[PDB]
Amino acid sequence: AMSRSRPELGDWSSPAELAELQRSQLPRVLAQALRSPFYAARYRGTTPPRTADDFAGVEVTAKQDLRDQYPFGMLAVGREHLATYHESSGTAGEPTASYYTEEDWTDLAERFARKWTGIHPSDTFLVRTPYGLVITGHLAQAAGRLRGATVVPGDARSLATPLSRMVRVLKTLDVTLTWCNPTEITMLAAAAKAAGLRPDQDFPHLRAMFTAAEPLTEVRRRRLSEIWGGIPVVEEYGSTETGTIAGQCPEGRMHLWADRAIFEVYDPRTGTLSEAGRGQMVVTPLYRDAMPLLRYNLADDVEVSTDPCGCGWLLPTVTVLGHRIGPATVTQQRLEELVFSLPAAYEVMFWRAKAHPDVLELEFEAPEPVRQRAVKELGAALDRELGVPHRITGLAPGTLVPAEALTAQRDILKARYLFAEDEDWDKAVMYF
Amino acid sequence: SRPELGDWSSPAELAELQRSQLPRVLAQALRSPFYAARYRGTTPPRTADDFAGVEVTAKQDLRDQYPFGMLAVGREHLATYHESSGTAGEPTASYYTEEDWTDLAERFARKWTGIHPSDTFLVRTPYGLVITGHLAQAAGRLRGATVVPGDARSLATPLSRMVRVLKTLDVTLTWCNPTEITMLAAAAKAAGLRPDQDFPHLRAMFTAAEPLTEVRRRRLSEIWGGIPVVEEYGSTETGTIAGQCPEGRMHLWADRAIFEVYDPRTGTLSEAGRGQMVVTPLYRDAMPLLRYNLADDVEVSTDPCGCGWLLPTVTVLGTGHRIGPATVTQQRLEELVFSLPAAYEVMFWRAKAHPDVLELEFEAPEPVRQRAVKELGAALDRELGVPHRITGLAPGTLVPAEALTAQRDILKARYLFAEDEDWDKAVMYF
Ligand SMILES: Nc1ncnc2c1ncn2[C@@H]1O[C@H](COP(=O)(O)O)[C@@H](O)[C@H]1O
Ligand SMILES: O=C(O)c1ccccc1O
Ligand SMILES: O=C(O)c1ccccc1O
Ligand SMILES: O=C(O)c1ccccc1O
Ligand SMILES: O=C(O)c1ccccc1O
Ligand SMILES: [Mg+2]
Ligand SMILES: [Mg+2]
Ligand SMILES: [Zn+2]
Ligand SMILES: [Zn+2]
C-alpha cells in the first residue's frame, strides 16, 4: 500500500493473513480505548490489556454501558478533534451517543462505499434515510462524495420530502442509485404507481437500490428487485455506533468487513466468544480514534459462517435474524417469506400481524379483484408451512398506507406573521 | 485562490478583484443550454465591460430550465443537487461541483463570532433537498467544529430532543430561523430549563430566512441570556451572500459575487440604493448565474461601517397591506410586538390585514395579558393609527404544548406484533 494505510479486499489471500492484519492493530486500539473515561474506570484497580494476546480476556461492552456513559463517557480524544456527533434510533428516552473524527469518517465512508455494483461519478444517488441525528443519511452522502456520485439529499421523515416529490426526483433526474430501508422501497413503488408510473419499466436509469435497517429475507429482497424491474437490491448491515459492518456480494450474501473490525459471536447462555456460529454480533472496530469500542455487543441475533461463498471474497458471511402460538413458533421472517411468495400480480406489499395466545391475526392491502385469492392462498401457505390457526383479512388499498402519504405535495413554507384578508393564517407560527 | 477579508484595501481594489473574474464567469455561463440559447444568433458577452449590458436572470428562468437547463459542466463533476423552498409544484433546481462547495462553505463560515474546533454546532435547518442544513454542516467541517445534525421539520428530531441536545452536549453555536429560536426557548422552559441562565456554553445563534428587525433580533438575544444573534442573508439557490458585522449591519460578500440593485419599473441596474437584489456569483461553475434577481426588496449602502470591513451593507425588506389610511408591513408590526417588555413573554403572534381593521392575536400568561393588549393597542394607535382588534391568548393556543414537549422514538418498520403492542406502527412507523 503506497498511498492507502487501511486494508482493501485483496490485501490478504488467507484467513491466517486476515487475522494478522487485525491483531497488528490491537496495540494502538487497546492504548486508544484506555484514554476513554469508561475503559480507564473499567480497568481502574488492575493491569489494562495492551497486547493482541491480552484481547482474548477483554470483557464485552454492552449497549447499556453506551447509554450509562451518555453523552461523552466513551470519548478518547479532545472534543476539538470531533467532526460529527450522532444518536441511535429506538427509544428517545435513553439516547446512545456516537461521534467520529475526520479520519474516523474516512473509514466509515470506505465501508459504506463497498457496494459490489460500484458508486461512480456517472451515478445520481438519492439518499432517502434520515439526516436528523442518526448517521445513515450522513454516511451515504459521505460515501457518494468519496466516489464522486451526485448526491440528492432526499432525507426521510422530513415534511420537505414526501414520496410524491421523491418519485418526481427519481424519474426526472434519471436517478441511478437509491439508499433507503426495504419498507421505503415498497413505499416508493406504491407512490410511483399512484403517480401513473410503473416501477418495473418507467425508471430505466435506476440500476441498483442500497438497503439496510430491517431484517430482510431473500424472498422479500427478490420481490423488491422484481417490483423495480429486476435491478439489484444491495443489502448492508450496520448501526449508528459501528457504521457498516457487512455488505452484500454479487451472490446475495452479506460479508463482514473483518479487515476493519474484529467480529465475534457472543453466546449469552455460556458467555463464550467465538469467531463464528449463532449468537449475538460482537464488534471491535480497528480504525476509530474518537469512540473506541472493545467487544461491543450489538445484541443482534446473527449466524456467522466462514464457509466459502461463490463471490470468492475471503470474508465470513452473516445472516441477521433480529412469538410462539400453541404448537408452532411464528417469526416475522417466516411470515414475510409467505406474504412475499404470493404472485407479484396480486400487488401485496403492505401487511401486519399480531400473535394472540391461540391465533395469528394478519391483515394486508390488495386490490379488490385479487383480494379473496390472496387471503385463501396465504391461509393455505400458513396451514402448509406453520400449521397455526389464523384470522387473515384483506384490506382496501389506502387502509394501512393512506393515499395522501403516496400523493400529497407540501410547500416548504417559512413562518409568516402578517396575512392578507383571503389567506389562511393557520400557517403563521406552525408553518411546517 | 479566492479572496479573504483584508485582500483589498479600497472600493477600487474590490471592483478589480470582481472584474478580473468576469471573462471566466461569462465563458462558463455560455456553456449552459439557457445562456447558449439566450445569446444564440448574436455575439455573446466576453469582457468585464460587456457585463454592463447583460440581461437579468429571473427565478422563473430557473424554474423553466428544470432540471439541468442551467448546467454548465458534465453531470460527472456534480457533487450535490438541491431544490428551493416555496411552491412544490414548480421546483427550482441548483447543483454544485466540489470547488463550488468550497466557496459556499467559506461564505457561510464568515461569522464575526468565528466557528472554531472548540465549538459544538447544532444545525437545526432542513437537510431535505434544500441546501441549508448541508451548508452549515460543510462550514462546520471546514472550520473543525463538532457538527450535531438536528435537521428541521423531521419527525426524528422534535424540539424536546433538540433542547436536551443543547443542554447535555454543551452546544456553543446554533443555526436555525428566528422563529425556531423562540420555539427552542419555549421548548426549553417546557423541559424545565431557563434559556437565559441554563445554557452557559451557548455563545452565539446564527439565523436567516425571515425578515428580522433589530427590535426582534435584540429580544431573541435577551431570551437566550444576551448572547449574540448573528443574522445572514442568502437564498436556497445562492447560499450566504451577506453576513452581520459586530456593529449589527449585514455586509455583502462582494469579493465572491457582483451585487446590483434592480429598479423593476425602468429595468435599470445600480451599484447601490433601493430595489431588487441582483447577484452574479464569481466562483460557481456547475450552475452559472448572470445577474440573478432574488426579487428581495433591499437598500444597499456603500457608506463605511465602524467594523472596518470594506464591503457595502444591505437592509432586507420583503410589499404590505392598506388598512384604511395606513400601510402596515410585517416589519413595522414586529417592531411593536417585540417592544413589549420581555417579562410579558410575547413571542408568538399573528395578524390579518382586512380592508378596515388589523386583526392581531398573541400568546401571553393571564396575569400580563390585559396590559399586553392595552400597551400593544396604544403602540399601534401611536405608530400606525390603524383600527385594530387585538386578542391575547393562553400559551399553548398558537404553539401547542405537544409541539414543545412530545418525544418520538425513531422506529423502523415492524410486521409481527405481540397481542398488547400497537400494530399501527407497522408500515406507517415515522
Ligand atoms: N441489513 C440489516 N438487517 C437486519 N437488521 C439490520 C440491518 N441493518 C441494520 N439493522 C438493525 O438496525 C440496527 C442499527 O440501529 P441504529 O444504530 O439505531 O440505526 C442494527 O443493530 C440492527 O438491529
Ligand atoms: O430509517 C431508515 O430509513 C434507515 C435506513 C438505513 C439505516 C438506518 C435507518 O434508520
Ligand atoms: O441501521 C443503521 O443505523 C445503519 C447505520 C449504518 C449502516 C447500515 C445501517 O443499517
Ligand atoms: O428553514 C429554516 O429553518 C432555514 C434556516 C436558515 C436558512 C434557510 C432556512 O430554510
Ligand atoms: O434561505 C435563506 O434565506 C438562506 C439564507 C442563508 C443561507 C442559505 C439559505 O437558504
Ligand atoms: Mg460527481
Ligand atoms: Mg472538531
Ligand atoms: Zn459472497
Ligand atoms: Zn459593518
Numbering used by the authors:
A (entry chain BBB): 0 to 321, 327 to 436
B (entry chain AAA): 4 to 321, 325 to 436
From the reporting publication:
We therefore soaked the co‐crystallized AMP:3HAA crystals with salicylic acid (SA), which lacks the hydroxyl at the meta position. In subunit A, two molecules of SA are bound but no AMP. One SA molecule, denoted SA1 has replaced 3‐HAA1. and occupies the same pocket with differences in orientation. A second molecule of SA, denoted SA2 is unambiguously located where we had tentatively identified 3‐HAA2. The pocket is formed by Thr128, Ala211, Ala212, Thr135, and Trp178. The carboxylate of SA2 makes a salt bridge with Arg156 that orients the molecule. A simple in silico change of the SA2 molecule to 3‐HAA2 molecule and combination with the 3‐HAA1‐AMP adenylate allows creation a model for the second reaction, the attack of hydroxyl (not the amine) of 3‐HAA2 upon the 3‐HAA1‐adenylate to yield the ester (not the amide). SA, which lacks a hydroxyl group at the meta position, gives no reaction, indicating that the hydroxyl must be at the meta position for reaction.
We reconstituted the biosynthesis of the benzoxazole moiety found in nataxazole by adding two enzymes (NatL2, NatAM), to 3‐HAA, ATP, and Mg2+. We have determined the structures of both NatL2 (homologue of BomJ) and NatAM (homologue of BomN) from the antitumor nataxazole pathway. We show NatL2 catalyzes ester not, as previously reported, amide formation; the amide is a shunt product. NatAM catalyzes benzoxazole from this ester by a mechanism that we propose involves shuttling of protons to control the fate of a hemiorthoamide intermediate.
